[PDB]
């Protein structure tokens, strides 16, 4: 086809998607946009990611080769080691699109040139990677979009020391979608750790722990009805897990300690409670299986009984459903700590702190996802991939422009369709959607449904918010409200937005857990979760504004997995969302690079006889003008050639 669509004949939405689907069909996945990646799920093996392929692109520059992945890495790299300035990857796409993938390409690549026989550097480097089959066990999980689907949002840090070698790397994590362990949509399954767990260990230590190899045997597991998929192959891979354990210093002393509490957690799970007509109370009836969970977290298994039928020197006692919420609340407890502890214990062998160093980040996020029932989880995840795309554009589209003008280089400016910056804010600052979630958790009186009254009544009347209220629409549940995500429309639910907004864990259910004699438990036991998460984003956003910006765009080429296919519509939605044309529009109109002006004076006068400078040293080396423009302070030069050049004499 045509790489880089700056090259396109006739700049049409049509003629892009064209193109696309030409290149994508004969395994084509990689096309520029002028230093932006865009890539298209092969949903199969390509034999391009090959140490070859990556001494192919190493050095080389993006013009000498086939749109590649690679060359993203490369040029970052390289730029690291140049200005000596921390660089970070921002990939985006829908659940499914392939940013996971495209991650670890990226680092694969990063990690290898970055060491070379030095054994000290590519043993970090082994590090560095086995950290990935290690929390996609974890964090991963098989959804109706993605089989792997990554359930957390994650940037992880290359750390390099000025001479370009890989010294270590720090790891951090985005909300975990922990009501997984609990619930899920029928067909789809929990985390991956506890089914491979459940085909991995011997029957040794599955007795010890009280467990039988079969994933039906847990409530929890037993009921979204799926325990097996296609894709991945549980047994197999779990040897892969244990193995990373030890090469990030997990020796079968913590192995076991993990084992425990996913063993606990399953155990948790099949608690049954009968109504204690003894008074009216509640009680334990499957007491072995409340037996095994408080083996397993080593504490008093009438403590623990007793925490899931009272709540508190004076015991109240709670009904069937109080008890079954508390059952959860508890499960869903252990494994966001013990995520969370996971991450950090990596970041212990990982995160080098004596030296300092440039850093390349590399962010990798949820995507956009919307499911048959949408709740708590993906308004934030979503609202996670609305600040994303907010930010390519404060970039992309609309930074780079408004420097033309206040440069003042005659510009016709290319209008970027929604700017969408009002999708965050219709969430975010007192009267956002958050905000007033939280406030409402305040009142002890209001409920889901009052909740779901304020933002109805404080919006619509302002767009991107619906509602069957005031726009009569049956569309709209009772219980629900359209929001219009810059990736189409999403239907939340507000059932249990409230007690999943609080995020609160009775003090009898810690302490019951502190009493723990097992290191490890007691260990993860020593502001609503979503203000909480709105700090992280707005964290996260500041500081990948503090580095060099490397853009990848990964589109979903269909929703069936099916290798070489395109579907159209789907594929056009994409392209349009993302603003992927008012891109290769800017970038024809537009130029190429625009180096500062003192920056040309002390760089290129070898060449010139002898921002003055700059004008000189063009009028002597014959350019036409049609191809630079001089800025009030800084030069621009439209095309890539006519800066090799240049350069390329020095
Ligand atoms: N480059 C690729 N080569 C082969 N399979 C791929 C590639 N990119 C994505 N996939 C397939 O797509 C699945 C989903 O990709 P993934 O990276 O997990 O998506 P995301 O991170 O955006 O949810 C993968 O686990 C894999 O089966
Ligand atoms: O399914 V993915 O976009 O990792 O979330
Ligand atoms: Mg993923």
Redesign the pocket.
């Known amino acids: 086809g045509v790489p880089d669509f700056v090259l396109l004949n006739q700049i049409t939405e049509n003629a892009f998607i064209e193109n696309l689907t030409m290149r994508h069909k004969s395994d084509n996945?990689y096309t520029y946009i002028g230093d932006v990646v865009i890539s298209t799920?092969?949903?199969?093996?390509?034999n391009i990611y090959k140490e070859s392929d990556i001494k192919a692109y190493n050095g080389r520059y993006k013009y000498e080769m086939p749109p590649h992945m690679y060359a993203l890495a490369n040029d970052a790299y390289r730029s690291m080691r140049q200005s000596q300035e921390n660089q970070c990857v921002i990939i985006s796409?829908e659940?499914?699109?392939?940013?996971?993938?495209?991650s670890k390409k990226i680092m694969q690549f990063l990690t290898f040139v970055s060491s070379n026989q030095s054994p000290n550097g590519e043993r970090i480097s082994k590090m560095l990677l086995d950290s990935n089959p290690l929390l996609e066990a974890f964090g991963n999980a098989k959804t109706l979009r993605?089989?792997?689907?990554?359930r957390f949002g994650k940037y992880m840090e290359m750390q390099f020391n000025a001479v370009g070698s890989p010294i270590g790397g720090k790891i951090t994590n985005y909300l975990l979608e922990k009501s997984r362990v609990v619930g899920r949509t029928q067909g789809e399954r929990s985390f991956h750790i506890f089914y491979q767990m459940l085909k991995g260990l011997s029957q040794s230590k599955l007795d010890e722990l009280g467990l039988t190899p079969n994933a039906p045997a847990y409530e929890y597991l037993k009921k979204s009805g799926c325990f097996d998929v296609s894709?991945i192959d549980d047994s197999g891979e779990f040897k892969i897990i244990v193995k990373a354990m030890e090469t990030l210093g997990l020796k079968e002393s913590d192995q076991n300690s993990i084992w425990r509490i996913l063993a606990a957690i399953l155990h948790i799970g099949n608690i049954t409670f009968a109504e204690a007509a003894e008074q009216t109370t509640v009680k334990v009836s499957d007491t072995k299986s409340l037996a095994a969970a408080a083996s397993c977290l080593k504490t008093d298994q009438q403590s623990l009984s007793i925490a899931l039928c009272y709540r508190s020197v004076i015991s109240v006692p709670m009904d069937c459903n109080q008890a079954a919420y508390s059952r959860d609340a508890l499960a869903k407890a252990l494994y966001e700590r013990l995520f969370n502890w996971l991450v950090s214990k990596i970041n212990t062998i990982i995160n080098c702190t004596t030296e300092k160093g440039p850093v390349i980040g590399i962010l990798?996020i949820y995507?956009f996802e919307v499911f048959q029932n949408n709740s708590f989880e993906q308004l934030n995840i979503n609202f996670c991939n609305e600040k994303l795309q907010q930010l390519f554009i404060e970039l992309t589209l609309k930074s780079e422009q408004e420097e033309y003008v206040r440069e003042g280089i005659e510009w016709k400016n290319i209008e970027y369709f929604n700017n969408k910056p009002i999708c965050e804010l219709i969430e975010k600052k007192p009267i956002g959607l958050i905000s007033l979630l939280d406030e409402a958790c305040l009142i002890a009186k209001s409920t889901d449904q009052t909740f779901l009254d304020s933002i109805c009544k404080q919006f619509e009347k302002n767009p991107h918010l619906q509602s069957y209220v005031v726009s009569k629409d049956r569309s709209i549940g009772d219980t629900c409200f359209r929001l219009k995500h810059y990736a189409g429309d999403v239907t939340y639910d507000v059932r249990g937005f409230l007690d999943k907004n609080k995020d609160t864990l009775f003090g009898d259910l810690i302490s019951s857990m502190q009493s723990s004699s097992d290191p490890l438990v007691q260990g993860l036991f020593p502001e609503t979760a979503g203000s909480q998460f709105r700090n992280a984003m707005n964290a996260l956003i500041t500081t990948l504004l503090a580095c060099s910006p490397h853009y990848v765009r990964?589109i979903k080429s269909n929703d069936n997995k099916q290798a070489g296919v395109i579907d159209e519509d789907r594929v056009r939605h994409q392209v349009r969302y993302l603003g992927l044309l008012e891109n290769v529009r800017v970038r024809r109109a537009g130029f190429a690079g625009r180096i500062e002006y003192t920056r040309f004076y002390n760089r290129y006068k070898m060449l010139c006889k002898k921002k003055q400078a700059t004008e000189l040293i063009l009028q002597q080396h014959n350019i036409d003008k049609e191809e630079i423009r001089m800025g009030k302070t800084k030069v621009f030069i439209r095309n890539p050639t006519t800066l090799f050049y240049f350069e390329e004499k020095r």
């Open positions: 996945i799920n092969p949903f199969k093996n390509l796409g659940s499914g699109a392939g940013k996971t993938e495209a993605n089989d792997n689907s990554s894709t990798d995507g990964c």
